């Protein structure tokens, strides 16, 4: 019997065992694991050997394994015997028992209860026999265990914690099968009898499961208070551990009666760190729990606000000096406190002011926001953003809360990433595991500070303007800011430039906040008087800023970018001065430095010129009417600078001129439009380009790869020689400059995109749209085939097989050109300047950069052409030309455009396909969709199947946060593939429509596009079959968000495809349902999307099985002998889906079981992680409200 197990365990742990004995024993004990008498042996060994910790743990593990796998087929006698064994084992807990053995005993107790407790409730008058089988004495036995020993009391607390965690937080399959019985019992045990009867459906049979009528909250709370009086730290920790899980779900009446909030506040003041964190989490849970007794909600909020002074003292104790090192013992407590304080802003309006409770609370938030750590400071920024936006809170925080917050935000609007001495880096190195993650969080924090400053400027415009003028005047008069005013170039990573950039950022935020004042302020008679005065102040500020005469390129860039914001209010008052300043800024020369060189300081001038051009374009786009007055003068002035502003600014200025021609109301619109667009678009119709566009060798020659071979031969470069360690000759620089200059002129892709986009940007009325279509029709139509040919050639460039005929010397160069370097800027602080030119490897890198630039611009050109509308969606060439160029098919195999990385596909999906699909007009959907949707869906499905198949079983479910060891190409490729899958899921969502979560309604808000697209897709099987094939793969693919969204989309589309055609049901019978049940429902890694997938599978099974008897044989074959026919008749008896969920869960459990050392730590870690995730979901209730795309 158990003697063999004892001998094997002694052998496996004997020091004389070695490899010989542990094979002898470990195999033997694993055999005992599957034996029928395993639970009896495990119970026997644990009771007989209490001193041996590991041996008793092994017996308890055997008993747990027996109750988790062999429990299903056990009869009533075996079940009751196992329950009695667990009961006896738990009651024998003594002092010498360790902590984890008590946890195992608690888990054993809970597992038995979940499968037996309350089973007799479903039958009216269950008599005495069912009561014994249903464990009617669960509460009484727990009460008996409560007063046996202190260790017994701790075991009871752990049992309660584990039971309440599984039922209400983890929501496992066993609880989900019997939720409607388990949850009322859980409410019963804690709440008193008289409280339960009023709220619930309490009957005579229910009261038999309760031991004490007072409830359990009448025992824990006095115990917690008594422990607080005696300062027993260890007991308080366990009591709070139980309370933090038991305080969410139960009724509010018992919580109010027992004064749990008072006990939590009392234990908050204690010196125990862990107890403070537990109390804070419990209070935060209590604040955000649902309240069906809003009258009871008043005292809970009032109690916290009345103790606002005590909360401040707690934060003061938690604060620590980070100069030496952080204190990880209490640092998370600070974050929890900050989150709990930030949550409280919702209940502010429902507080009666008696002792400045609201005033005290807002001061506490302001003090919290001053925390040196970035995370806790940013946790309260969303509070100020929401609080300032609402007009109700303004009179409350108007007193000495606004100026301090504004000053703090202005002082904190700095670049934390680059400054070395900032204290935030110490917290960054512990809270953020990646430099890129810290940079992204810093950018988000700076954006939120921007929003705060804008809101402050809008709310308190007079005071904010006065303070800003006082600060700006003082800063430039300081002996530290005058360096900027008297310097040409400055270090873009040092303090003197950063401070001035921050000041200009603050000025930009203030100006942006003045625009919102136009809408926020009411339209009363004072609107005209106030607005006139503000415009004078803005004009004075603009004149003062201009008079500074800045010269630093990047700072002048920021000042020029600020000019567009000024024009919104000043309008014609300042337009002439701004136009004069911008024009001379781009033309301004820098004789001290030659602009031909690609130095870091030289790139600033180019960036400033680009910004000036784009700002001129935006200024023209804003309003052309006043620009028409000086149109001849502007034309002459700009033509005077034609030979000097290079090609880029030439295109920018031509586009600027084109805006005035179209948007304004001058004469000869056609002639002026043709005078500018035609010279730039002429290169598209070149005879040499047209003929050579179909030949890849001509494309290579024009790119200059063959010309590079001559340079390599002259330099005597070998193909096998490494290109990373070869210096660049001065001839190479000239060759690169010549090639990049000729390439842009050969394909005027940039000019076409800007021209079309700005011509079709602001289209007032409807007659203007018709005229503009007639203008672009003779031009775009003969050029679209050439654009598609160029895109196809560029896509075929990435193919390794294409360049086989190229010279062998430049083969390695071309291979190095194709790789997308290491790809994973909207804030003005980050500066990159795209490095410099050092080695021959960078020559391949820059050629690839040119290739990707051309591809991105041709995608933008295609999107802009799609923005035209009828002229592009009507011709029969467009549906076929676009798809042929996007994806190519080699004569052999089925690879879709071999040689292009995932990132390129992600961009060509998110740049061209999205606007083309979304931009189709209602009248044009009937002609473009039938010739475009099927091939596109087939291409997407095949590509997604191919890309994911390379490493199908080689990831984890959730993305892994990258770090210093995680720039491995596998991780980056995985992230890019996930992003591409998300992009195609968004494509499907925008195309057809996504459903809601388990809470159902009358479908989603399918406004206008989705109705038209659903009619085309669903009524055409030729388009429906590829779409259904694509959708199945999306669900089958291993990802969290994409699978959930695909399942929701399938549920939305489930009720309109299941009976239209016979062929559709054939695919559903064999492919969709089999994949859903076997690869999603059966798989244990899809727990996040289990509920929606289960519901979709149920809806599929119900309708399909009704009319297809042949499907039942398939289900019988898949499920391995399950009575499918019995399932159909059993389910049809109950109309409610909630009852059928238990039946489907039981059916799935059969399929999973039939098709089914470090394990202990792995399961424990997984349970801890999912418990933490559930706690976060509960805490952020009404803020998260689920996650979708």
From Swiss-Prot:
GO terms for cellular component: cytoplasm; nucleus; RNA nuclear export complex. It holds the Pfam family Exportin-5. InterPro entries: ARM-like (IPR011989), ARM-type_fold (IPR016024), Exportin-5_C (IPR045478), XPO1/5 (IPR045065). SUPFAM superfamilies: ARM repeat (SSF48371). One of its GO terms (biological process) is protein export from nucleus. It comes from the Eukaryota. GO terms for molecular function: nuclear export signal receptor activity; RNA binding. Present with 3500 molecules/cell in log phase SD medium. Interacts with CEX1. This is Protein MSN5. The gene is MSN5.
């Amino acid at each position: 019997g158990a003697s063999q197990i004892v001998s094997a365990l002694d052998v496996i742990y004997s020091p004389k065992s070695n490899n010989s004995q542990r094979q002898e024993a470990q195999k033997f004990l694993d055999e005992v694991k599957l034996c029928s008498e395993s639970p009896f042996w495990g119970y026997e060994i644990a009771l007989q050997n209490p001193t041996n910790s590991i041996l008793k743990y092994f017996g308890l593990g055997l008993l747990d394994h027996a109750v988790k796998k062999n429990w299903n087929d056990y009869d009533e006698g075996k079940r009751v015997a196992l329950r009695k064994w667990v009961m006896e084992l738990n009651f024998g807990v003594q002092d010498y028992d360790t902590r984890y053995i008590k946890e195992k005993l608690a888990t054993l107790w809970v597992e038995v209860a979940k499968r037996t407790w309350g089973e007799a409730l479903k039958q009216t008058n269950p008599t005495e026999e069912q009561l014994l089988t249903s464990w009617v004495d669960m509460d009484n036995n727990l009460f008996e265990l409560w007063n046996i020993n202190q260790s017994s009391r701790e075991l009871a607390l752990i049992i309660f914690r584990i039971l309440f965690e599984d039922v209400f937080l983890l929501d496992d399959l066993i609880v989900l099968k019997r939720m409607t019985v388990i949850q009322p019992l859980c409410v019963m045990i804690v709440c008193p009898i008289e409280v339960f009867a009023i709220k619930y459906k309490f009957s005579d049979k229910w009261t038999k499961f309760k031991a004490n009528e007072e409830g359990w909250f009448s025992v824990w709370i006095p115990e917690l208070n008594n422990a607080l009086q005696q300062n027993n730290s260890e007991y308080i920790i366990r009591l709070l551990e139980t309370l933090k899980t038991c305080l969410n779900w139960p009724l509010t009446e018992v919580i109010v009666r027992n004064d749990v909030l008072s006990s939590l506040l009392t234990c908050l003041s204690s010196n125990i760190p862990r107890a403070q964190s537990m109390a804070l989490d419990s209070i935060h849970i209590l604040l955000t729990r649902p309240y069906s007794n809003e009258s009871h909600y008043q005292m809970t909020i009032d109690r916290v606000f009345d103790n606002m002074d005590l909360l401040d003292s707690v934060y003061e104790s938690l604060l620590f000096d980070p100069t030496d090192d952080i204190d990880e013992t209490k640092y998370p407590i600070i974050k929890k406190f900050v989150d709990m304080i930030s949550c409280l802003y919702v209940c502010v309006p429902k507080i009666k002011e008696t002792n400045g409770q609201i005033q005290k609370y807002f001061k506490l938030v302001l003090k919290t926001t001053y925390n040196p750590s970035l995370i806790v400071s940013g946790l309260t920024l969303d509070l100020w953003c929401t609080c300032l936006r609402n007009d109700e809170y303004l009179p409350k925080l108007e007193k000495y809360v606004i100026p301090d917050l504004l000053q703090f935000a202005a002082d904190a609007l700095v670049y934390y990433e680059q400054i070395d001495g900032h204290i935030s880096k110490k917290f960054a190195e512990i809270d953020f595991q990646s430099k890129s993650e810290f940079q992204t969080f810093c950018s988000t924090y700076r954006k939120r500070i921007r929003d705060i400053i804008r809101l402050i400027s809008c709310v308190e415009l007079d005071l904010t303007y006065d303070w800003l003028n006082n600060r700006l005047n003082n800063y430039f008069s300081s002996p530290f800011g005058q360096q900027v005013l008297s310097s040409t170039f400055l270090d873009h990573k040092l303090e003197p430039y950063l401070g001035a950039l921050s000041q200009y950022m603050i000025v930009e935020c203030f100006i942006n906040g003045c625009i919102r004042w136009k809408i926020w302020y009411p339209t009363g008679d004072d609107y005209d008087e106030k607005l006139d005065s503000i415009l004078q102040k803005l004009e004075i500020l603009s004149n003062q800023l201009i008079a500074l005469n800045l010269r630093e390129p990047l700072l002048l860039k920021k000042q020029i970018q600020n000019f567009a914001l000024f024009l919104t209010m000043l309008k014609d008052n300042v337009l002439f001065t701004l136009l004069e300043k911008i024009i001379t800024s781009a033309t301004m020369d820098y004789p001290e430095i030659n602009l031909e060189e690609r130095g870091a300081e030289s790139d600033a001038v180019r960036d400033l010129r680009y910004a000036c051009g784009i700002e001129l374009n935006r200024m023209a786009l804003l309003m052309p009417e006043s620009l028409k007055k000086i149109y001849p003068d502007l034309e002459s002035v700009i033509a005077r600078i034609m030979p000097n502003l290079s090609y880029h600014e030439k295109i920018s200025f031509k586009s600027f001129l084109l805006i005035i021609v179209l948007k304004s109301s001058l004469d000869m619109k056609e002639e002026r439009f043709a005078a500018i667009v035609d010279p730039e678009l002429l290169a598209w119709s070149d005879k040499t380009t047209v003929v050579g566009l179909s030949d890849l060798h001509w494309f290579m020659e024009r790119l200059g790869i063959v010309q590079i071979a001559e340079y390599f031969q002259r330099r005597d470069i070998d193909e096998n020689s490494d290109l990373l360690s070869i210096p660049i000759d001065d001839e190479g620089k000239e060759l690169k400059s010549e090639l990049t200059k000729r390439w842009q002129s050969l394909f005027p892709v940039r000019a076409t995109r800007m021209f079309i986009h700005y011509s079709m940007q602001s289209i007032k009325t409807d007659e203007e749209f018709k005229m503009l279509q007639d203008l672009w029709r003779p031009r775009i139509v003969p050029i679209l085939p050439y654009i598609t040919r160029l895109l196809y050639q560029l896509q075929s460039y990435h193919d390794p097989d294409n360049w086989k005929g190229l010279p062998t010397v430049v083969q390695s160069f071309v291979k190095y050109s194709t790789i997308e370097r290491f790809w994973e800027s909207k804030d003005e602080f980050i500066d990159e300047h795209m490095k410099a030119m050092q080695t021959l490897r960078d020559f391949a890198d820059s050629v690839g950069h040119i290739i990707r630039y051309t591809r991105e611009y041709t995608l933008l050109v295609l999107s802009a052409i799609s923005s035209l509308g009828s002229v592009f969606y009507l011709l029969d060439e467009s549906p076929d030309l676009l798809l042929n160029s996007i994806a190519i098919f080699k004569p052999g195999s089925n690879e879709i455009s071999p040689g292009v990385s995932t990132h390129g596909w992600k961009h060509i999906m998110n740049i061209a396909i999205r606007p083309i699909l979304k931009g189709c007009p209602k009248d044009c959907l009937g002609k473009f969709m039938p010739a475009f949707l099927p091939k596109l869906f087939e291409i997407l499905d095949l590509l997604l199947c191919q890309k994911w198949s390379s490493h199908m079983n080689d990831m984890d479910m959730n993305p892994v946060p990258t770090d210093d060891d995680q720039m491995t190409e596998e991780i980056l490729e995985e992230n890019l593939l996930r992003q591409l899958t998300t992009v195609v899921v968004r494509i499907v969502i925008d195309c057809v429509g996504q459903g809601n979560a388990n809470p159902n309604s009358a479908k989603s808000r399918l406004n206008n596009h989705q109705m038209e697209m659903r009619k085309i897709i669903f009524n055409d099987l030729n388009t429906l079959a590829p779409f259904l094939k694509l959708l199945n793969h999306l669900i089958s693919f291993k990802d969290t968000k994409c699978s959930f969204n695909s399942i929701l989309v399938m549920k939305c589309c489930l009720t309109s495809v299941l009976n239209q055609n016979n062929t559709v049901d054939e695919y559903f019978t064999f492919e969709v349902m089999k994949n859903l049940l076997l690869n999603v429902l059966c798989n244990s890694a899809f727990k996040d999307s289990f509920h929606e997938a289960l519901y979709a599978f149920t809806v599929i099974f119900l309708t399909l099985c009704k009319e297809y008897p042949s499907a039942r044989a398939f289900l019988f074959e898949i499920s391995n002998g399950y009575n499918i026919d019995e399932l159909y008749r059993n389910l049809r008896s109950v109309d409610e889906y909630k009852t059928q969920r238990a039946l489907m869960i039981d059916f799935i459990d059969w399929v999973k079981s039939t098709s089914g050392a470090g394990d202990e730590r792995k399961r424990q870690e997984k349970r801890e992680a999912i418990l933490k995730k559930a706690n976060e979901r509960l805490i952020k209730k009404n803020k998260e409200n689920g996650d979708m795309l």
